[PDB]
Amino acid sequence: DIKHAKLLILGSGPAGYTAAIYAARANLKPVLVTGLQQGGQLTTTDEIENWPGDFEMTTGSGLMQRMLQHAEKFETEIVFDHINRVDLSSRPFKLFGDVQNFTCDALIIATGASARYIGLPSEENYKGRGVSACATCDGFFYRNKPVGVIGGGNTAVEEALYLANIASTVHLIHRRDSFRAEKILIDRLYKKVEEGKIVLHTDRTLDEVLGDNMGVTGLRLANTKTGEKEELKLDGLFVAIGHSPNTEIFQGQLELNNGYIVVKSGLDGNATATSVEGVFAAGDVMDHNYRQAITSAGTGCMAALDAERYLDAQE
Amino acid sequence: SNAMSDIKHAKLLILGSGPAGYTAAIYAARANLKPVLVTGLQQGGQLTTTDEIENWPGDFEMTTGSGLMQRMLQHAEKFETEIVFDHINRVDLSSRPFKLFGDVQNFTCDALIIATGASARYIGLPSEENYKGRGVSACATCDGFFYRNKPVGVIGGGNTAVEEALYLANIASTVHLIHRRDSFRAEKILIDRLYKKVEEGKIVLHTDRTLDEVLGDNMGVTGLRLANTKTGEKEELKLDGLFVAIGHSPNTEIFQGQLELNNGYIVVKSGLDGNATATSVEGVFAAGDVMDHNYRQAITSAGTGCMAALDAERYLDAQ
Ligand SMILES: Cc1cc2nc3c(=O)[nH]c(=O)nc-3n(C[C@H](O)[C@H](O)[C@H](O)COP(=O)(O)OP(=O)(O)OC[C@H]3O[C@@H](n4cnc5c(N)ncnc54)[C@H](O)[C@@H]3O)c2cc1C
Ligand SMILES: Cc1cc2nc3c(=O)[nH]c(=O)nc-3n(C[C@H](O)[C@H](O)[C@H](O)COP(=O)(O)OP(=O)(O)OC[C@H]3O[C@@H](n4cnc5c(N)ncnc54)[C@H](O)[C@@H]3O)c2cc1C
Ligand code: NA
């Protein structure tokens, strides 16, 4: 039972929904596939303060529910599925889902990015039993208990700041001695450090995630300059070492650059066009530099307008 | 006041109070760049000349362009952006701090984000120039109230002309939509709404027509002479106001000879490796419709405004 769409959008983050809204207003009758994280990465943050025009109190989940209802306002067909294989070698394009299969005349890819892991066997062993990559999902378990966050970028800082309202102590662990985040969040971070609420463990790498048959009980860390080992007692570990683009299913199907989908870019339009004619990409899956909801939504709009111009040219 | 007190220095200066400029201010303020934003003469930008906006993602109920832009203003002020009411009439980008000269005061800055957008074009006729402010307008929300229950004309065939015709269709007695082709290029949902109004007779289509002259008396417009594009048959139309909606041109006259331009748009690096809003002058960035001749949406302008703030932060940090 192959479901055919004129325009198929993969992803229910801000790029996917913005593409759907524009495509629906162009009378393209878009079909949007949600994926397994409906709403996208913003559903794993708490307050969003830099969505322009939301100056009061907006949560990531609240914003993405608005975008869902916006796409539905213009009758976007929203389908739950997870695409596990694509074949772009001929048209119409073929996509293979956990629930059903699809074909389409134009494809907008907005599959975003997902958290990476450090790769230790002990880390794997405790995934979903005290090792997590989503602070808002699992933070409540650690009310008044010690937790760890590993990483030094804008995700690690946001997760440490979120957990600082919940945990007794947040141990923020990084293999360098400085952090990279919006400066307003660096300011908040160091205030919590001066209050003793966040404890910094700089120039440290994870050596082993420790625990028992229930869950995590601590970490062994290694000094990046001496090799010297140390142990830390804690109840949960949040791995925040970066989100890599969700493009495994496009290996061998599209031009990628370090996993990001290569698009035309440029100043002459058709800027979201991939290496395959009729396939476009928007949002974090093609952006390794800005990584914002607002920039993802902007390229989502561009992909819809690019896809409209392409379908118009097919007669 | 003296020449020294008229020179405000900003670490980062943003020109324009449309969605590109305000989004840049929000990000720049959160990057501790203490931004100063110069509003220009159209505070809030082009969206203050439209009524409802239906494609700002996440605004699914009833939002107007002016409502959204007032929100963005308050958002920039939340992070303590300094908002300055001025219009820049000249710049010198040859030295750092960059020098800008305003109608009200002068400025210097360590980095500059240009988000000056675009303004409505006029056809270029003497009769059209003669009746500006006397019945010739390029802003339907500004002036439409004065034509309640009177006939009006809109000229143009694109998204702006259709949206302005749809707006005036609720105010004028009749809207005459005039265009030099038989076809209109706008969002297909808007085209559907246009033809519902045409079929209701509230909008009357004048296809294959060009403006030959704008007619009036000592006090203001009284009609138009149109020319058939096919034959050349001239004809006259009685109406009280004309809204010219033939597109917008990027506001870059003050950057001529200062930045690389292409058909008046500011050329930026673009690309996929960051620093995408950098102009030909190091430390100067451009965002929004002033650099985008292809998409021209609020959401795309806001996205590039964010990029310009992040690029300017990376530039200032490196100094
Ligand atoms: C903790 C955290 C905090 C953040 N805070 C902010 C903030 O304050 N401000 C801000 O601007 N940005 C913030 N961001 C970044 C922002 O969330 C992203 O830039 C944005 O969500 C990117 O949107 P996107 O649509 O490109 O992708 P995503 O939001 O990642 O959405 C991808 C979508 O694709 C779907 N998908 C993935 N793989 C498949 C598949 N195989 N088949 C089908 N569907 C698939 C997913 O289910 C998801 O719905 C934050 C990110 C994180 C992780
Ligand atoms: C009638 C109409 C309807 C529209 N409807 C929609 C819609 O429904 N959805 C949508 O997404 N988009 C819509 N748009 C387009 C949208 O308004 C623009 O894409 C967007 O406003 C561009 O933002 P910007 O910040 O780049 O420029 P602008 O909004 O043009 O802002 C430019 C700013 O720069 C300032 N400025 C200019 N020159 C100077 C100077 N010399 N010194 C200082 N400041 C200066 C101006 O005062 C202004 O504040 C519409 C446009 C029009 C005209
Ligand atoms: Na409202």
Domain residue ranges in chain A:
1-115+243-313, 116-242
Instruction: Give the helix/strand (H/E) hosting B188.
Output: helix B188-199
Whether B142 sits among the annotated catalytic residues: the reply is yes
Q: How far apart are CA B243 and CA B147, in angstroms?
A: 11
Using only C-alpha atoms, chain A has a radius of gyration, in whole angstroms, of 21
Say which experimental method was used.
X-ray
Beta bridge partners of B227: B210, B234
CA distances from B137 to B122, B153, B174, B299 (A): 9, 10, 17, 26
Ligand 2 touching residue B8 (CB < 6 A): no
Which of B276, B298, B264, B283 is closest to B21 using CA atoms? Answer: B298
Which of A39, A211, A212, A246 is closest to A136 using CA atoms? Answer: A39
Q: How far apart are CA B226 and CA B56, in angstroms?
A: 37
Which CATH code, of 3.40.190.80, 3.30.70.100, 3.40.50.1000, 3.50.50.60, is assigned to A1-115+243-313?
3.50.50.60
Domains A1-115+243-313 and A116-242 share a fold: yes
Pairing of strands A216-223, A229-233: antiparallel
Burial class (CB in 10 A: 0-12, 13-18, 19+), A311: middle
Angle at B124 between CA B121 and CA B126, to 5 degrees: 140
Residue where the block lists tokens 């209109």: B184
Check: CB of residue A31 under 8 Å from CB of residue A9. Answer: yes
Residue B3 contacts by C-beta under 8 Å, 6 or more apart in sequence?
none
Check: CB of residue B316 under 8 Å from CB of residue A314. Answer: no
Backbone angles phi, psi at A179, to 5 degrees: -120, 150
Q: Which chain B residue has its CA at the smallest distance from A187's CA?
A: B32
Which of A53, A182, A302 is facing B295, going by the closest CB pair? A302
Check: CB of residue A244 under 8 Å from CB of residue A223. Answer: no
Q: Which of A137, A177, A187, A312 is catalytic?
A: A137
Angle at A204 between CA A199 and CA A205, to 5 degrees: 125
Q: How far apart are CA A297 and CA A309, in angstroms?
A: 19
Residues composing chain B? 319
Task: Tell if the CB–CB gap between B57 and A302 is shorter than 8 Å.
Answer: no
Backbone angles phi, psi at A239, to 5 degrees: -95, 120
Q: How far apart are CA A111 and CA A82, in angstroms?
A: 10
Q: Order across the sheet with A236-239: list the strands.
A: A131-132, A236-239, A146-150, A169-173, A198-201
Q: How far apart are CA B219 and CA B216, in angstroms?
A: 7
DSSP, residue by residue, A112-142: -EEE-----HHHHHHBTTTEES-HHHHGGGG
Structure token digits, residue B217: 């008396």
Ligand 2 touching residue B144 (CB < 6 A): no
Structure token digits, residue B167: 């707006």
Structure token digits, residue B185: 């290029």
Check: CB of residue B265 under 8 Å from CB of residue B289. Answer: no
**What CATH topology corresponds to A116-242?**
FAD/NAD(P)-binding domain (3.50.50)
Q: How far apart are CA B178 and CA B210, in angstroms?
A: 8
Q: How far apart are CA A80 and CA A174, in angstroms?
A: 37
Q: How far apart are CA B220 and CA B214, in angstroms?
A: 10
Angle at A292 between CA A290 and CA A296, to 5 degrees: 95
Q: How far apart are CA A260 and CA A254, in angstroms?
A: 10
Q: One-letter amino acid identity for B221?
A: V
Structure token digits, residue B18: 């449309």
Q: Does residue B245 have a known ligand-binding role?
A: no
- From first CA to last CA, the distance across chain B in angstroms is 33
Angle at B61 between CA B56 and CA B65, to 5 degrees: 45
Task: Tell if the CB–CB gap between A271 and B293 is shorter than 8 Å.
Answer: no
> Residues of A122-137 as b/e, b for ≥16 C-beta within 10 angstroms?
bbeebeeebbbbbbbe
Tell me which CATH code domain B1-120+248-318 carries: 3.50.50.60
A96: three-class secondary structure by DSSP = strand
Which of B270, B300, B303 is facing A267, going by the closest CB pair? B270
> Residues of B11-46 as b/e, b for ≥16 C-beta within 10 angstroms?
bbbbbbbbbbbbbbbbbbbbbbbebbbbbbebbbbb
Give the side-chain half-sphere CA count within 13 A for B248: 27
CA distances from A208 to A212, A235, A238, A303, B47 (A): 13, 14, 14, 43, 55
A contact test, residue of B74, B294, B310 with most A CBs within 10 A: B294
Residue B282 contacts by C-beta under 8 Å, 6 or more apart in sequence?
B315
Residue B253 contacts by C-beta under 8 Å, 6 or more apart in sequence?
none
Using only C-alpha atoms, chain B has a radius of gyration, in whole angstroms, of 21
Residue where the block lists tokens 């869950």: A215
- Sequence-ordered alpha helix ranges (H) in chain A: 14-25, 60-73, 121-126, 135-138, 154-163, 183-194, 293-313
Check: CB of residue A79 under 8 Å from CB of residue A101. Answer: no
Q: How far apart are CA B169 and CA B186, in angstroms?
A: 17
Give the side-chain half-sphere CA count within 13 A for B160: 23
B129: three-class secondary structure by DSSP = helix
Superfamily of B121-247 according to CATH: FAD/NAD(P)-binding domain (3.50.50.60)
Check: CB of residue B311 under 8 Å from CB of residue B273. Answer: no
Q: What is the DSSP letter of B127?
A: H
Check: CB of residue B15 under 8 Å from CB of residue B88. Answer: yes
Determine contact: A57 vs chain B, CB below 8 A. no
